Amino acid sequence: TMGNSTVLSFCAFAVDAAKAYKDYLASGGQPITNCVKMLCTHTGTGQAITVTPEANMDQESFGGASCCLYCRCHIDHPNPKGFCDLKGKYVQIPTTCANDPVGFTLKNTVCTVCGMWKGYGCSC
Ligand SMILES: [Cl-]
Ligand SMILES: [Cl-]
Ligand SMILES: [Cl-]
Ligand SMILES: [Zn+2]
Ligand SMILES: [Zn+2]
Numbered sequence: 001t002m003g004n005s006t007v008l009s010f011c012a013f014a015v016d017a018a019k020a021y022k023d024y025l026a027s028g029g030q031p032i033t034n035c036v037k038m039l040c041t042h043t044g045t046g047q048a049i050t051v052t053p054e055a056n057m058d059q060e061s062f063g064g065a066s067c068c069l070y071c072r073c074h075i076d077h078p079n080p081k082g083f084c085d086l087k088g089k090y091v092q093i094p095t096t097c098a099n100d101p102v103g104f105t106l107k108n109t110v111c112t113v114c115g116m117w118k119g120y121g122c123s124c
Contacts, residue, residue, distance in 0.1 A: 031100035
Protein backbone atom coordinates (compact mmCIF):
# COMPACT_ATOMS: atom_id res chain seq x y z
CA THR A 1 0.00 0.00 0.00
CA MET A 2 1.16 3.62 -0.47
CA GLY A 3 2.58 5.79 2.38
CA ASN A 4 1.70 9.35 3.38
CA SER A 5 4.69 11.18 1.89
CA THR A 6 4.34 9.33 -1.42
CA VAL A 7 0.59 10.10 -1.71
CA LEU A 8 1.03 13.73 -0.70
CA SER A 9 3.96 14.34 -3.07
CA PHE A 10 2.00 12.83 -5.97
CA CYS A 11 -1.00 15.11 -5.29
CA ALA A 12 1.04 18.21 -4.41
CA PHE A 13 2.75 18.39 -7.79
CA ALA A 14 -0.31 17.50 -9.82
CA VAL A 15 -1.99 20.31 -11.71
CA ASP A 16 -5.23 19.35 -9.82
CA ALA A 17 -4.38 18.06 -6.40
CA ALA A 18 -7.94 17.38 -5.38
CA LYS A 19 -8.61 15.30 -8.51
CA ALA A 20 -5.39 13.34 -7.93
CA TYR A 21 -6.40 12.35 -4.39
CA LYS A 22 -10.00 11.57 -5.33
CA ASP A 23 -8.88 9.40 -8.26
CA TYR A 24 -6.38 7.64 -5.98
CA LEU A 25 -9.10 6.91 -3.42
CA ALA A 26 -11.46 5.67 -6.14
CA SER A 27 -8.80 3.19 -7.29
CA GLY A 28 -8.65 1.65 -3.80
CA GLY A 29 -5.68 3.65 -2.52
CA GLN A 30 -4.91 3.69 1.19
CA PRO A 31 -6.10 6.99 2.73
CA ILE A 32 -3.71 9.56 4.14
CA THR A 33 -3.16 8.86 7.87
CA ASN A 34 -1.73 10.72 10.91
CA CYS A 35 -4.54 13.27 11.15
CA VAL A 36 -4.75 14.76 14.66
CA LYS A 37 -7.68 13.22 16.55
CA MET A 38 -9.19 15.11 19.49
CA LEU A 39 -10.24 13.82 22.89
CA CYS A 40 -13.73 15.31 23.48
CA THR A 41 -17.07 14.59 25.18
CA HIS A 42 -19.05 13.72 22.00
CA THR A 43 -21.94 15.82 23.34
CA GLY A 44 -21.11 18.84 21.18
CA THR A 45 -23.21 20.72 18.66
CA GLY A 46 -22.25 18.54 15.68
CA GLN A 47 -21.48 21.58 13.52
CA ALA A 48 -18.93 20.81 10.78
CA ILE A 49 -16.12 23.32 11.48
CA THR A 50 -15.82 24.95 14.88
CA VAL A 51 -13.64 27.02 17.21
CA THR A 52 -13.29 24.10 19.67
CA PRO A 53 -14.18 20.41 19.24
CA GLU A 54 -17.94 19.89 18.83
CA ALA A 55 -18.32 16.23 17.90
CA ASN A 56 -21.70 14.69 18.67
CA MET A 57 -22.20 10.97 19.41
CA ASP A 58 -21.94 10.14 15.67
CA GLN A 59 -18.72 12.04 14.93
CA GLU A 60 -15.05 12.37 15.69
CA SER A 61 -13.27 15.71 16.03
CA PHE A 62 -9.87 16.44 14.44
CA GLY A 63 -7.45 19.34 14.20
CA GLY A 64 -8.48 21.11 11.00
CA ALA A 65 -5.17 21.63 9.18
CA SER A 66 -4.23 17.97 9.59
CA CYS A 67 -7.41 17.04 7.64
CA CYS A 68 -6.87 19.53 4.79
CA LEU A 69 -5.27 18.23 1.57
CA TYR A 70 -3.80 21.66 0.73
CA CYS A 71 -2.30 22.12 4.20
CA ARG A 72 -0.88 18.59 4.22
CA CYS A 73 0.57 19.10 0.69
CA HIS A 74 1.96 22.57 1.66
CA ILE A 75 0.31 24.14 -1.41
CA ASP A 76 -1.93 27.15 -2.10
CA HIS A 77 -5.63 26.80 -1.38
CA PRO A 78 -8.13 27.12 -4.25
CA ASN A 79 -9.44 30.65 -4.11
CA PRO A 80 -8.25 34.23 -4.87
CA LYS A 81 -7.61 34.68 -1.21
CA GLY A 82 -5.99 31.29 -0.66
CA PHE A 83 -7.86 31.18 2.65
CA CYS A 84 -8.23 27.84 4.44
CA ASP A 85 -11.56 27.12 6.19
CA LEU A 86 -10.00 24.37 8.36
CA LYS A 87 -6.65 25.74 9.61
CA GLY A 88 -6.74 26.78 13.25
CA LYS A 89 -10.18 25.21 13.78
CA TYR A 90 -11.60 21.77 14.59
CA VAL A 91 -13.46 19.63 12.10
CA GLN A 92 -16.19 17.11 12.92
CA ILE A 93 -16.15 13.98 10.73
CA PRO A 94 -18.85 11.24 10.80
CA THR A 95 -17.21 8.33 12.61
CA THR A 96 -17.95 6.03 9.63
CA CYS A 97 -15.65 8.31 7.60
CA ALA A 98 -13.01 8.93 10.26
CA ASN A 99 -10.62 6.51 8.54
CA ASP A 100 -10.12 9.19 5.82
CA PRO A 101 -10.65 12.73 7.15
CA VAL A 102 -8.72 14.35 4.31
CA GLY A 103 -10.95 12.71 1.73
CA PHE A 104 -14.06 13.59 3.67
CA THR A 105 -13.32 17.32 3.91
CA LEU A 106 -12.16 17.43 0.28
CA LYS A 107 -15.38 15.84 -1.02
CA ASN A 108 -18.01 17.47 1.14
CA THR A 109 -19.60 20.88 1.71
CA VAL A 110 -20.88 22.63 4.85
CA CYS A 111 -24.53 23.66 4.79
CA THR A 112 -24.67 27.47 4.88
CA VAL A 113 -27.99 27.26 6.77
CA CYS A 114 -27.42 24.81 9.61
CA GLY A 115 -23.61 24.61 9.66
CA MET A 116 -23.56 20.80 9.34
CA TRP A 117 -22.12 18.70 6.50
CA LYS A 118 -24.53 18.36 3.59
CA GLY A 119 -25.61 14.75 3.15
CA TYR A 120 -24.50 13.72 6.64
CA GLY A 121 -25.51 15.74 9.70
CA CYS A 122 -27.48 18.38 7.78
CA SER A 123 -31.22 17.80 8.24
CA CYS A 124 -32.40 20.83 6.24
CL1 LIG B 1 5.95 7.08 1.88
CL1 LIG C 1 -1.08 7.97 18.08
CL1 LIG D 1 -21.86 15.38 10.00
ZN1 LIG E 1 -5.80 24.06 4.53
ZN1 LIG F 1 -28.53 22.19 6.62
